Design a protein around this ligand. Sequence first.
Ligand SMILES: Cc1cc2nc3c(=O)[nH]c(=O)nc-3n(C[C@H](O)[C@H](O)[C@H](O)COP(=O)(O)OP(=O)(O)OC[C@H]3O[C@@H](n4cnc5c(N)ncnc54)[C@H](O)[C@@H]3O)c2cc1C
Ligand code: NA
Length: 423
Amino acid sequence: SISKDSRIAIIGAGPAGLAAGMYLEQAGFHDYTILERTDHVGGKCHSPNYHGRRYEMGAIMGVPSYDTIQEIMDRTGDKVDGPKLRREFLHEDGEIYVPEKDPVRGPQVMAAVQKLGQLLATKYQGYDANGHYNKVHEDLMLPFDEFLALNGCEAARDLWINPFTAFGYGHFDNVPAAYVLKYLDFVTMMSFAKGDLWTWADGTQAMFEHLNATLEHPAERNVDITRITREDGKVHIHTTDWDRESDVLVLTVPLEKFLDYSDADDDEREYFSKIIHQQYMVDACLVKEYPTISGYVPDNMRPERLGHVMVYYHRWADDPHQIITTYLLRNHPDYADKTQEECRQMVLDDMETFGHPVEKIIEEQTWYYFPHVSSEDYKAGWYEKVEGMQGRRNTFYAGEIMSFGNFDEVCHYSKDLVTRFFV
Ligand SMILES: Cc1cc2nc3c(=O)[nH]c(=O)nc-3n(C[C@H](O)[C@H](O)[C@H](O)COP(=O)(O)OP(=O)(O)OC[C@H]3O[C@@H](n4cnc5c(N)ncnc54)[C@H](O)[C@@H]3O)c2cc1C
Ligand code: NA
């Protein structure tokens, strides 16, 4: 479909762009370049150093069905070798509870989970295909909570919420089921429930730094792209230090932000303007009365508790002076955005309520997170349109918006992008 001698410009050296280069290269496309704006690779897989070890400012974990990430690891020599994950559940007052042994609610949840599994196995068979170019059932276009209510499966939300809302992906009242069930597909949900999770001692970033190194063309970094245009069957890229012509453009960067430095056409502008994102804030903390385990707080995952700590990550069990990361959301469609200052204050108060008071915040990051569209826009055929635009003026669209904000999903999509359009 596309000629091996094409000059291919990939924008972004996150998992998505690095994967694009890997699978292009392995398909015989040797003239790609990856353009990265920062000084580093891995994107939201970001594993900085502290006291001889690496902590996670972004992604922490995978599941055994992360087949594409296994291929990446087959290529780099990396191994799943991080510390074990364990967790407790806390109420918003900090008291420990065991929802798995709630004799009334527990059965209700697992019964709903059983029923949903059967629906997914029959009625919604195909729901978990990567990307959204296979048009899902209309039901999956509804907010997850409405999708569950339609099917009499409300109580299932209790299991699904913890690795979703706490993981920054937003709230079940508004986020379409399509996203939730592609990420937390039945088998993936089961792996999470069971604690069968991948972590890396050197961070999730490490395998991406290593992938980049294995590439024929490691990413070019500190590349400040000021403008892109696509006249006359060609791509023209202008950066502070140069400007070059390519034959093919691959975007793994945010598509609404792309509008501000490109000759974006009417469709691009109209549709990329609909993209909404999460403001997901992570605080790298030194604390007293070091936790003995990670904690989730479902009470603080309610929209009424927006900006509160939903979860904190106990990474290094042996060293009580190592980093504990905290996680909170600053936005919700039906609420005013929470300010950084006020959310930072909640980090301190909540961690104190939890009995693990903060001595120091050494790093803090609000991420551009989980780009997506509303149920209304999804229903109106957003992905039909954008997937119909694939290749228009030699521009291909990828990254988080085109699949899901998880590093296996975006890598998987980049791989299939090669199969779908290039080979
Ligand atoms: C706190 C947190 C927890 C997470 N937990 C998990 C998890 O448990 N499991 C999981 O699978 N995933 C997890 N993720 C999500 C995962 O990290 C991302 O979905 C993944 O990194 C997406 O890869 P990407 O390449 O599409 O986007 P990104 O990682 O965001 O990378 C995009 C790249 O493009 C670059 N870029 C942006 N603009 C430009 C520009 N204008 N010009 C050039 N380059 C540009 C960026 O600098 C970046 O390198 C987590 C993320 C965070 C923040
Ligand atoms: Na459970």
